[PDB]
Symmetry: D2
Subunit: 116 residues, 4 copies
């Protein structure tokens, strides 16, 4: 699985379940081409977005629909979404975990990049 | 000042100087109109981006050029930038501080919103 | 496994391997009684610290030896360690994951608390 | 002011007012000597804890009473407090800002260290 997304809720201390995630890859004309999408599981994780063969070098964007999550919980959010833009595989294929820790007025994102 | 951006370096424990910041506002046709730009000062802060009169209701995007900051220190970071998108002034005028805490493979962002 | 500790490195974008972790429980005389200890695995995780029978209600402290980690990497750290103090199981047994994201001059900690 | 503490609420996007802060210094016998204390102001900041003359080399502990803050808002948070332990002024006098960003199940802390 070369790309995994994990989303956590800092208000409730829980994984964020059923949050929509969209992945894009930058096109030659600096536009965002859809690439993959899904919703997080009960563990807050989204697997199976891509394969090692499709996940070539390039710039990728991960958009997490955080606003819809907080609205479903009845909490007023600040951000429209959480976005993460990064260059992938520039030094050979890696396994990427994009982790996002969500609060209504703050979020953090980290990348855990390992070599299989 | 209705909009301030502050940027900190979590590796060195210091404000980030001369980091480029670009602000955009979503137009009626759902395109990003350039709104303001600047670079952070010695204190890591960028003031004077806009005025209360110009800073009307809308969706705004703040893009911080974190990659150039790390590259100038010799580091190839994970993220291409740090981008924050939010609705502003939907309940009347507020003062917004957008703060970003930077590491090579992680960043966090918060919003401090006050009512003068 | 009622208690797991996970530690991540925000500079290198990797799990923190071989970091020492010590767990204490507060004694009747407000002193810290040792409870469990270990070192993180290749995945940055420390499992098997306790059992559901031993992990009773109480106040617990998790101390992560972050200073030794950064010294081993040749990076100057700010903190002497990372500590997390929390009340456990006050509403029935839970599964706790204590996650720490480390930078030389900053750290974050979250708790993911689930019901089996 | 050589030592400042700033505390922010990541749920509401606001500084935290009237949060208790206690500072300790490690003595020769390895005990924590009370050094200074105060409460955060309307801006979430606590100034005037010490002077450059009194703030000598040593190991210091800053304990922020985050639990009382959340309890006053009706929330039972995960952490009992936020505690930061660090060596100060080992390379000469510095100015330290300890900043804490609070959520019910997560907190982050950073240090901004400057040389006047
Ligand atoms: C920015 C941030 C801070 C803390 C967390 C975080 O709490 C977390 C929790 C996990 O169970 C876990 O498996 C991972 N991970 O794999 O990276 C991260 C996640 C994101
Ligand atoms: C995501 C994050 C976490 C912590 C900080 C942070 O450390 C910080 C430091 C300041 O001196 C300061 O004035 C503010 N602020 O007002 O927002 C934040 C900044 C950003």
């Amino acid at each position: 699985c070369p790309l995994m997304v994990k989303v956590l809720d800092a208000v409730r201390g829980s994984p964020t379940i059923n949050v929509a995630v969209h992945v894009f890859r930058k096109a030659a004309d600096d536009t965002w081409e859809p690439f993959a999408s899904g919703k997080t599981s009960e563990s807050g994780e989204l697997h199976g977005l891509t394969t090692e063969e499709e996940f070539v070098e390039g710039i990728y964007k991960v958009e997490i629909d955080t606003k819809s999550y907080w609205k479903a919980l009845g909490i007023s959010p600040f951000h429209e979404h959480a976005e993460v833009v990064f260059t992938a595989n520039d030094s050979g294929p890696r396994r990427y975990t994009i982790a996002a820790l969500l609060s209504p007025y703050s979020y953090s994102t980290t990348a855990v990049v390992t070599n299989p």
